[PDB]
Amino acid sequence: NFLVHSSNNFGAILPSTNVGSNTY
Amino acid sequence: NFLVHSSNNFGAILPSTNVGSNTY
Amino acid sequence: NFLVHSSNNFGAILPSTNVGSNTY
Amino acid sequence: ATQRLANFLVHSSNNFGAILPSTNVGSNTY
Amino acid sequence: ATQRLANFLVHSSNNFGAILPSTNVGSNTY
């Protein structure tokens, strides 16, 4: 029934992430 | 029934994030 | 039934965020 | 520490390119 | 510490490019 163009992406060319410490 | 252009992205060329510490 | 241009993005070229500490 | 989380509902009828990044607990950067 | 969270509803009828980043607890940067 459904007629969809369904095109999705992500932009990440250089993630660089230093979370550290978490407590929950 | 539905006719959609459904194009979504993210912008992130250089994330650099230092969360630290969390308590919840 | 629905005819939508549905284009969404984010702007983040250099996030750099140091949360610290939270209590909830 | 500890946690107590319950009964989370994210219902949406229709979002025409509506940005609702309704993120619960966690550390992401994409 | 601790937490007690319940009964969260994000209902939307129609959002024509409405920005509702209704984010609950967590650390994100995108």
Add this chain to the structure above:
Amino acid sequence: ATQRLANFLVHSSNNFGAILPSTNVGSNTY
């Protein structure tokens, strides 16, 4: 510390590019 949060409703009929970033508890920067 602690928390007690309940019964949160974000209902919108129609938003023509209305900016309602109705964010509950959490640390974001986008």
Add this chain to the structure above:
Amino acid sequence: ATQRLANFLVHSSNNFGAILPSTNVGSNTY
């Protein structure tokens, strides 16, 4: 430390390119 997490619902009726990266606990970058 410890954790207590329950009753998480992410229901969506219809999302026309709606961005809802509703991520629970964890460390991702994509």
Add this chain to the structure above:
Amino acid sequence: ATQRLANFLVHSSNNFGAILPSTNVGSNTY
């Protein structure tokens, strides 16, 4: 440390290119 996680539901009716990377605990980069 320890963990206690239960009752996680990710139900979606229809997502027209909706991005819901609802990732629970773990370390991924893709």
Add this chain to the structure above:
Amino acid sequence: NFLVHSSNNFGAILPSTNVGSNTY
């Protein structure tokens, strides 16, 4: 039924934010 141009973005070229401490 609905015919919308639905283009939305964010402006953030250099966030740098040091929350500190919160109690709720």
Add this chain to the structure above:
Amino acid sequence: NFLVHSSNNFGAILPSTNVGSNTY
């Protein structure tokens, strides 16, 4: 019944991420 173009990808040319330590 359903007629969909269903094309999805990820953008990651150089992830480099140093998580550190987590407690849950």
